[PDB]
C-alpha cells in the first residue's frame, strides 16, 4: 500500500509503441 | 443598370431580390415566366443581370438580360439534372472534429455520433439545456476544419441577444436568424427561401451545411401558419404541415454526384407536450443520427450533457473502420454499463488528457 509503489502503470511493449507513436504524432506537423 | 440577388418565385410567378436582411425589400427584379423557363431557374437562384431601373408604371426592375447565375455561366443552370434525379448515397466523407478551445465536447460528439457530409441527424434536448451553445461550438469547429464547405446556420424563434452574440461570434460565416419577436409568417418564409437557395447550391454539386435552431419551434410555427390541414393529429398537430419541414429535412443527403447537403437541427424534448415528443418521433425516423441531451445532466452543470446511451448513427462503417466500429462496440458496452451522470463525470476525467488526435489514437489503444 505504500504510495511509492501503490500505483504502477503496466503496459506491454507493442501498446507502448502505439501510445508513443501517438505521442510523436501528438507533436503535429 | 445591373441588378443582383436571390430568386424568390412567388405564387404569381414573379420574383424578389433580397439583401443581407433576407426578407422582403425593394431592390427586387421581376423575372418573367418566359425567362424562368428559358433558364430553367427555380427560386433561390443567385441571379445577376443587366436590368434598367423600373420603367414608367413599373414598380420593380425587369431583368432585361441575365449574365451570371449560380456564380457561373448560365447554360449550367438550364442544362443540369433535376435535384430529385440525383443519385443519393450514404455519408462517406466524415468531418474530423478536432478543435482546441473545447476539445472534450467535439471529441465526444465525433467519437459517439460521428458526422459526415450528407448526414441527417438531430440534436435532441430540453430547452435552456445546451442546444444553442453546442451548435455554436460545432459551427466554429466546422469553420476551422472544413473551410471549403459553404457553412450556413439558421436560427428560428430565438432570443435576439443570442442572435447578436452568435453573429458576433460567427466570424463572418453566413448567419441568418429569425427571432421569436418576428411573426411566424416571416419565419416560414425565410426558412423556405433558405431551403430553395441551399437546394440550388447543392444542384451545383456543392457541399451545403445547414445548422437549424428550434426544429420543434419550427414545426410549431408551421402549425400556427398552416391554417387547416383538416384532420388534427394526436395532441393538436397538423398532419400535412410537417411535410414542408419534412421536405426541408429529408432534402439533406449524401449525393454521389458531388457536393453534399448536411443539415443538423435542434430538437426540444421532454418539454411535457405530446406535440413536441410526437414531432420528435416523425422526424426521428427521417434522420440518420440522434444525439440526446438530458435535463438532469445539464442540471448538474455537466457539459456536454449528452444522453450517451441512446445516441448513435447508421452505417458507421461507411464513416468508420471495422477497427473503429469494433472499438465503438466495446466502448458502448462499457458505457451501457456506465451510468449517465457517472458516465459524463468519469469520461470527462478520462478523455481530457489527450486531444482529439492524441485522444483518438491513444484511446484506440485505451478504449
Amino acid at each position: 500500500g505504500s504510495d511509492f509503489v501503490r500505483f504502477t502503470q503496466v503496459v506491454d511493449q507493442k501498446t507502448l509503441k502505439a501510445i508513443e507513436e501517438a505521442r510523436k504524432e501528438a507533436v503535429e506537423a | 443598370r445591373l441588378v443582383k440577388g436571390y430568386l424568390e418565385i412567388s405564387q404569381d410567378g414573379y420574383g424578389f431580390l433580397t439583401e443581407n436582411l433576407h426578407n422582403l425589400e425593394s431592390r427586387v427584379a421581376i423575372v418573367s415566366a418566359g425567362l424562368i423557363k428559358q433558364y430553367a431557374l427555380r427560386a433561390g437562384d443567385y441571379v445577376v443581370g443587366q436590368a434598367r431601373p423600373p420603367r414608367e408604371n413599373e414598380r420593380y426592375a425587369t431583368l432585361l438580360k441575365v449574365e451570371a447565375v449560380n456564380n457561373l455561366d448560365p447554360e449550367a443552370a438550364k442544362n443540369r439534372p433535376r435535384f430529385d434525379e440525383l443519385t443519393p448515397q450514404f455519408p462517406d466523407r466524415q468531418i474530423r472534429l478536432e478543435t482546441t478551445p473545447d476539445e472534450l465536447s467535439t471529441r465526444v460528439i465525433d467519437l459517439l455520433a460521428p458526422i459526415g457530409r450528407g448526414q441527417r441527424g438531430l440534436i435532441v434536448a430540453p430547452p435552456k439545456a445546451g442546444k444553442t451553445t453546442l451548435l455554436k461550438k460545432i459551427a466554429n469547429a466546422v469553420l476551422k476544419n472544413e473551410p471549403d464547405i459553404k457553412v450556413i446556420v439558421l436560427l428560428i424563434d430565438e432570443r435576439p441577444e443570442e442572435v447578436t452574440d452568435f453573429r458576433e461570434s460567427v466570424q463572418g460565416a453566413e448567419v441568418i436568424a429569425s427571432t421569436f419577436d418576428e411573426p411566424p409568417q416571416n419565419h416560414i418564409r425565410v426558412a423556405e427561401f433558405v431551403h430553395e437557395r441551399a437546394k440550388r447550391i447543392v444542384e451545383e454539386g456543392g457541399h451545403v451545411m445547414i445548422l437549424l435552431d428550434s426544429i420543434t419551434r419550427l414545426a410549431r410555427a408551421n402549425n400556427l401558419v398552416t391554417p387547416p390541414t383538416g384532420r388534427t393529429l394526436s395532441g393538436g398537430l397538423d398532419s400535412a404541415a410537417l411535410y414542408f419541414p419534412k421536405r426541408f429535412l429529408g432534402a439533406a443527403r449524401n449525393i454521389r454526384g458531388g457536393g453534399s447537403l448536411t443539415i443538423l437541427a435542434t430538437a426540444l424534448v421532454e418539454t411535457g407536450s405530446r406535440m413536441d415528443d410526437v414531432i420528435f418521433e416523425e422526424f426521428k425516423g427521417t434522420g440518420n443520427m440522434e444525439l440526446h441531451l438530458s435535463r438532469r445532466l445539464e442540471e448538474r452543470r455537466i457539459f456536454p450533457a449528452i444522453d450517451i446511451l441512446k445516441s448513435g448513427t447508421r452505417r458507421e462503417e461507411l464513416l468508420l473502420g471495422e477497427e473503429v466500429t469494433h472499438k465503438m462496440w466495446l466502448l458502448r458496452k462499457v458505457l451501457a454499463d456506465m451510468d449517465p451522470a457517472e458516465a459524463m463525470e468519469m469520461l470527462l476525467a478520462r478523455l481530457a488528457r489527450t486531444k482529439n488526435n492524441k485522444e483518438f489514437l491513444a484511446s484506440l489503444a485505451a478504449r
Binding site: S2, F4, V5, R6, F7, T8, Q9, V10, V11, D12, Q13, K14, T15, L16, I19 | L330, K333, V334, D337, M338, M346, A349, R350, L351, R353, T354, A362, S363, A366, R367
Partner: protein, 91 residues
C-alpha cells in the same frame, strides 16, 4: 520455482515494484483475456495432460514469463494514469 527470479530482482530496484508490476499485468491479462499477450507465437506455457496453459491455468506465471522478455516496460508515470485507471474498473 519460476524462470530466473534472480534476473527478476536484478532488473528492478525494489521487490514491491516487481510485485505490483506482475500483478497489474495479470489483471490486464484477465480483463482483456489472454489475447493481449506478447509471447504468443511459439513459446507459450504448456500443461502435461494437454496444452491447457495456452489459455488460462495461472495468470501470475503468465505475467512473469512475459516479463523475462524485453516486451514489458513499466514506470511510475509513463502514460497519463487517470485515463487507464478510470477505464480499467468498468469492464
Amino acid at each position: 520455482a519460476e524462470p530466473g527470479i534472480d534476473k527478476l530482482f536484478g532488473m528492478v530496484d525494489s521487490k514491491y515494484r516487481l510485485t505490483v508490476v506482475v500483478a497489474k499485468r495479470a489483471q490486464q491479462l484477465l480483463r482483456h483475456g489472454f489475447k493481449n499477450t506478447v509471447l504468443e507465437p511459439e513459446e507459450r506455457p504448456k500443461m502435461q495432460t494437454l496444452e491447457g496453459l495456452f489459455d488460462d491455468p495461472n495468470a501470475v506465471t503468465w505475467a512473469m514469463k512475459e516479463l523475462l522478455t524485453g516486451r514489458l516496460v513499466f514506470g511510475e508515470n509513463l502514460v497519463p494514469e487517470d485515463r487507464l485507471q478510470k477505464e480499467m474498473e468498468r469492464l
